[PDB]
Each structure stands twice: as structure tokens, then as C-alpha cells.
Subunit: 263 residues, 2 copies
């Protein structure tokens, strides 16, 4: 049906400007359903998922700029003007940056931008730790259905998803392979994205499970975005690993922080 469509309507009712959330490298935005309980219950929530999932024969975007233009089209279809509130995680963070710059060049107003623990890429020497990991994409998918974490493979995750959530019943080997395809493409887009300066404030959520890390280190990690952000760079830390940021407690903290900044 509509489980894998590019624009994913997680909640359409609400009079305020929607929050648009862009997928991690895995391509699925069902994970941001963990936010609905905690953002204002009058805020619509839309997901943006990767081309190539609903239609495995679709031409995948070859740059983050092209992916961002596609998604800007989609979100302008839902919200004609007003402040655009974007949220990203991993690849989505890069995508929303591009979206935000494009929206600005169009004279549109950009509201809240929430970056879940993604930092700029050294294009001459891409650090593995700055890039998506396949096991992390599978962990994100397993968190989506509350799998108790205590080497993953696609078939096991698909079986948990089809068991667990009824709307993944018709998730077949075609869709599993399309997920792998989208992940590979998304990984090939990190090394070639050059973000442009953005005249807006950004909120960066830092995933730091180690509480022995000094606050200055979190702030310095966050200031890697300074060459591309001309506004305030605000940050907040959750005590979990990068893939676990939509588990119940970090999702609650992120959602409540978002609600208070949109209020």
C-alpha cells in the first residue's frame, strides 16, 4: 500500500505547521513515530522516505541536493508557506541542511531544524564513524518495534518487523533488497555533499552514552557545523548510542525539547 511511500503521513490533523522528518540512511521514517506522543498533539508529523522503496525500479538520486529538491517538492505539497520545521537523523540531517538552504534561496521561511547526531563529512578522507553503518541501520529498524537488544541480518529484522507490526506484512525479498539498495546509494552520497552556509538556527542532538565525556567536548563536536550555520547552534545530549536515539527515553527527551522550542 502506502507503507513505503516517499511522503509518509504519520499524523495529518493539527492546525500548526507540521514537523517533517527525513529518514536515516536506511530509508524508512517509521522510526520517528516515537516522537508523536511528545510533540504538541496539534502538530502534524510527516515522514520522508527514500525513493526506491515503494518503486524498486525508480531512479535513485545521485546527490543529497537532488534528494533534498525532491523532498522539498513533497513537503511544499503539504505546507504551502510558513515556517518549515525539519528534523533529520544521520543522512536525513545532511538532507535537511540542503533542504533548508534551498528553501532559503526560494525566499521561504525556515523554522526549527533538528539534527540527530550527524556531523560534517571530511570529503577528502571520510571518517567511518561519521558515516552510516549497516548494523546501525538494522538496529534502528529493530528499535522501531521494541526489540530487546540484550551480527544482525536483514532477514531476521524483516521477520521481526513482519511479525511485530502488521503494516509490514507484505514486506518481501524484493523490499529487503530495495532497502539494501537504498542504503548503498545513501552511503555513496555522503562523500560528495558540500553543505552551503545557512542563515538559520539549528538544534543538534548529541548521542553520548559515556557520561565521563566533558561538556566542552560535546559543545566542540556540535561546533563542527559552524562553517555551514550562521545562526545559533544549540545542542542537547541524550545518553544513548547513535542508533538508539528513538528508544523511549531519548525519544521522549527529543520530543519534549522540540515541543518546547515550537511552543
Amino acid at each position: 500500500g502506502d507503507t513505503l511511500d516517499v511522503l509518509l503521513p504519520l499524523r495529518t490533523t493539527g492546525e500548526k505547521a507540521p514537523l517533517f522528518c527525513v529518514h536515516p540512511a536506511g530509508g524508512l521514517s517509521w522510526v520517528y513515530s516515537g516522537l508523536m506522543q511528545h510533540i504538541g498533539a496539534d502538530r502534524p508529523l510527516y515522514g520522508l522516505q527514500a525513493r526506491g522503496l515503494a518503486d524498486p525500479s525508480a531512479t535513485l538520486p545521485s546527490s543529497i541536493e537532488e534528494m533534498a529538491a525532491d523532498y522539498v517538492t513533497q513537503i511544499r505539497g503539504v505546507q504551502p508557506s510558513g515556517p518549515y520545521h525539519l528534523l533529520g537523523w544521520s543522512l536525513g540531517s545532511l538532507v535537511i541542511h540542503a533542504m533548508a538552504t534551498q528553501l532559503r534561496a526560494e525566499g521561504e521561511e525556515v523554522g526549527l531544524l533538528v539534527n540527530l547526531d550527524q556531523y560534517p563529512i571530511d570529503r577528502s578522507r571520510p571518517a567511518p564513524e561519521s558515516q552510516p553503518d549497516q548494523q546501525d541501520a538494522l538496529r534502528i529498524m529493530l528499535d522501531f518495534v521494541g526489540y530487546d537488544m540484550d551480527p544482525l541480518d536483514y532477514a531476521m529484522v524483516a521477520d521481526v518487523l513482519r511479525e511485530r507490526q502488521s503494516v509490514f506484512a507484505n514486506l518481501d525479498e524484493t523490499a529487503i533488497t530495495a532497502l539494501a539498495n537504498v542504503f548503498a546509494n545513501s552511503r555513496s552520497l555522503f562523500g560528495s555533499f558540500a553543505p552551503q552556509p545557512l542563515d538559520s538556527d539549528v538544534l543538534v542532538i548529541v548521542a553520548e552514552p559515556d557520561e565521563t565525556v566533558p561538556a566542552a567536548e560535546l559543545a566542540a563536536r556540535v561546533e563542527q557545523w559552524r562553517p555551514f550555520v550562521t545562526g545559533k547552534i544549540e545542542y542537547q545530549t541524550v545518553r544513548c548510542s547513535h542508533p538508539h536515539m528513538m528508544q523511549p527515553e531519548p525519544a521522549a527527551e527529543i520530543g519534549r525539547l522540540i515541543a518546547e522550542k515550537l511552543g
Copy 2:
């Protein structure tokens, strides 16, 4: 067992210098078994496969240079000196280029370099067509077992065909399928970051052009895209198949015979 190891001994016997073949983006070098019949029966043939297949817990290389250094270690274990004959396909071509430059920086002699239809990447805007495609990696694997292509591929279907046709892929499980996807995603992230260095060697480029109406000058210019990175002779030869089908029987026969011709 030993099906997925980094160094794959396809033929170890022979007095002549081996041919070392580096995997396409899919990570598997079994496909180059299509060459054994046609390269001299005195030539050893070794495959180089991706880290992360035999051990899904291995640290994957983060650059083509690091992958190439790993593989140079492996091939020096088989051949202590002499001319190093390298063959690559898709990602492997980039890898062998790096290997050759490293080998020449170490004062080692590089012999034949065979590039199967890979061209340099514009790192500021990587063209999709010059990059690996997942369906093409699956087609390469299906060609390996002679599947007939006049029939959207998926990993599970390919794994079942592989298990059914060649039983050294028996007990190829979901762990291994996942590891193949992982390897493919990583290899795809290695394009666009790799800056090839000038290589003072001759290279042979095999062009995959199924369209006979393409003029010969276009094939030659396509090949001369390698000129900034090759200071020697750039020779080329065309096979009448698409990129993923270059190890089917007729292109494999042409490539193997040409290689024997150049090594003889």
C-alpha cells in the same frame, strides 16, 4: 570453509607468475573462474575478495588505498617478486590501480594491468553510470552460475540459485547475504573519495559496448579518460556485452585469450 576468504586460490599450480583478480563491488572473485580455461594452463590464478565476507565482524576498509594495501600484502604472500599481473572489474579496477602504484612505490615491477570497463570518477559530481549498481552486482553473481537472463533481482533469489548450482555456496546463510550487502554499500562509499595517482605502466582496458553502432573513436576516447593517471601505453579491446556480463562465455573467452596473448 574457505569460499569467502580474502585470498581465493582458483588455481595454484603453474610455474608462471600468477594473475591476481580483484573483486567487483559485490566482493566475490569466483566470477573470474571464467578465465581459467583461456589463460595459459601454466598460469596460477588467484582471486582477491572483500574483507567482511569470511568475517562479518571485520573492520571494513575506509579507502581504496587501504583495501589495496591489504591486497598487496596478500599477493606478496603468494609472489615474492617478479612482474605482478593484476586484473580488476568495476571497483577492482580502481583497487588494482592503487595496488599498482603502491607496488611501484616499493620498487616492485608491475606487469599486465587489466581494467574491465571502469573509468575515472568525477569526485565533485560522481556519475551514477560510472558507479556500481546493485542489480548489476546481482547479475554478475547470476552469470557466475550460468543463469539465463531472459527471465528486479533480489539477494534471496540469487542465493538460492547459487546454493542450487554450485554446492561450495551450500550453507551460504542470511548472515552471509547481509555481509554481501554490507560489502557492497561500503565499496560504493569508496568511489568519489579515491584520487588515483599517476602510474608509469601500460594498461589494458576492456570496453563493454553492446551497441555496434558506437564509433571506434568513442571507445578510444572513453578509454583515454585514464590518461591523467597512466603515463604508459593505454591499450584497449571491446567486448560486445554490457558491463555486468563481461564474464559470460564469449566475453570471458575473448578477455582470457587476449590476456594469454599478452602474457605469452
